[PDB]
Amino acid sequence: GTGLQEQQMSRGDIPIIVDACISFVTQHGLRLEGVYRKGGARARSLRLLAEFRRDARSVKLRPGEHFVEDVTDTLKRFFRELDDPVTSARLLPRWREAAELPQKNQRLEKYKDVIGCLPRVNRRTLATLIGHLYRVQKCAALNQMCTRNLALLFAPSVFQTDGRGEHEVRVLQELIDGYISVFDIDSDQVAQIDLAIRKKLVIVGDGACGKTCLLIVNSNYVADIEVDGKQVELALWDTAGQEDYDRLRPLSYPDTDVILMCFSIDSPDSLENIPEKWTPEVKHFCPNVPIILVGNKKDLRNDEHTRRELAKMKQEPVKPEEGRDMANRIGAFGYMECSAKTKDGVREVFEMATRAALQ
Ligand SMILES: Nc1nc2c(ncn2[C@@H]2O[C@H](COP(=O)(O)OP(=O)(O)O)[C@@H](O)[C@H]2O)c(=O)[nH]1
Ligand code: ALF
Ligand SMILES: [Mg+2]
């Protein structure tokens, strides 16, 4: 193997895995809302990564055949699993020092100096990645991925941080925003680019499937709920859906009394990750804790735009019976659908969770 120097290299002297994923996402993904925030179905996307590891130049990514979210996941996993972060562990002191200078122009010039000390393959790979993220955020009116969000999603794999690394998020954000300057992009490329009872609740589920909005519309938070005569102080613990936070998420699990396990009705992949990812993790850290399987964004089930996007990959919104079958398959206490956006079903979600916690 997973070393940067051991990879099959493109004509451009960067790893083919990086070149191929970035090219595909650039062609077919710059409009996808939540690109790089949403993830693919675990087993399917890990197969694609394994193909790239076996023989990267043999993988031909084709629209309609490969999921954008599998490819974005593959790119992040590539950087996360390098023996050494592409930014170099040995230069992390200089990165941090650069990040603490007072004025942005001074930080950019220092970042430029650090990048200059990297090995050639690292520099060219980092340049290609940052230029890609620069293009992504320029399309944020469509994909909703501003520079700050991309930096939060990419800093853990790029720098190989624990998951909370504050200096590295600033660097990445400023590298993206300052891409043209830091990487000496000439004016021709600039033009070409222009074209009494207390109970603990934890919520888990795929990135962007609506966990935080569900906690917010109802309300670490606290909600006071009354069910069956009993007044309950429900402690709400929010968690991140991305793989990058897998090491930090178990901090939230101790003492949990009920789990909200979420998928989005507009994402069959997020339902498929219920048995593949969330159920094994939750049953390992929260044995014998009741699970409410929650289908979020119910308002999108018959939404025309949603139905058209999923049909491109021969998918359709999750049906109520599919969620119920899944709830039975994993041994959930119950199944419930809701829309944080319209508030429909939100009370029923937390009332069922509270009854589960009290049984
Ligand atoms: N249509 C619709 N969109 C939603 C709903 N809930 C959340 N969203 C959107 O989905 C995106 C991610 O939501 P968020 O709760 O932050 O996702 P989280 O990553 O799981 O915490 C945001 O753009 C929300 O506005 C919903 O019930 N209906
Ligand atoms: F993508 Al999230 F909480 F913002 F899982
Ligand atoms: Mg969230």
> Read out DSSP for 167-191?
HHHHHHHHHHHTHHHHTT--HHHHH
> What is the best residue among 213, 237, 338 to mutate for testing ligand 1's pocket, by most ligand atoms within 8 Å of CB?
213
Which CATH architecture is the domain 196-359 placed in?
3-Layer(aba) Sandwich (3.40)
343 known ligand binder: no
Resolution given for this structure, in angstroms: 2.1
Do residues 235 and 256 lie in contact, with contact meaning Cβ atoms separated by under 8 Å? no
Distance between CA 302 and CA 266 in Å, rounded? 9
Cα dihedral 223→227→229→233 (10° resolution): -20
By C-alpha distance, which of 27, 78, 81, 68 is closest to 269? 68
Enumerate long-range contacts of 196-199, CB under 8 Å, 24 or more apart.
Answer: 196/231, 196/233, 197/230, 197/231, 197/232, 197/233, 197/358, 198/232, 198/233, 198/235, 199/232, 199/233, 199/234, 199/235, 199/257, 199/258, 199/354, 199/357, 199/358
Torsion angles phi and psi, residue 305, rounded to 5: -60, -45
Distance 45 CA to ligand 2 centre (A): 19
| Residue 318, both tokens | 């999750």
Q: Report the separation in Å between the CA atom of 199 and the middle of ligand 2, taken as the mean of its atom positions.
A: 23
- Identify whether the C-beta of residue 210 lies closer than 8 Å to the C-beta of residue 270: no
**Ligand 2 closest atom vs CA 38:** 1
Instruction: Specify the domain boundaries for CATH 1.10.555.10 within the chain.
Output: 1-195
| C-alpha distances in Å from residue 100, one per residue of 89, 170, 174, 226, 322 | 18, 10, 12, 49, 51
DSSP conformation letters of 130-142 = HHHHHHHHHTHHH
How many whole angstroms from 182 Cα to the centroid of ligand 1?
A: 34
Name the DSSP class of 319.
P
CATH 3.40.50.300 in the chain, residues? 196-359
Query: What was the structure determination method?
Result: X-ray
Residues 95, 110: Cα–Cα separation, whole Å: 8
Q: Is 210 in the pocket of ligand 1 (CB under 6 A)?
A: yes
Bridge partners for 324 per DSSP: none
Beta strand 334-337 pairing with 291-296: parallel
Burial 313-344 (b: 16+ CB within 10 A, else e): beeebbeeebbbebbeebebbbbbbbbbeeee
SS3 content of the chain, % helix, strand, coil (to 5): 55, 10, 35
> What is the whole-number distance in angstroms between the Cα of residue 259 and the centre of ligand 1?
19
**CA separation for the pair 349, 200 (Å, rounded):** 15
Atom in ligand 1 nearest the alpha carbon of residue 33 = 23
Classified by CATH at the fold level, domain 1-195 comes out as Phosphatidylinositol 3-kinase; Chain A (1.10.555)
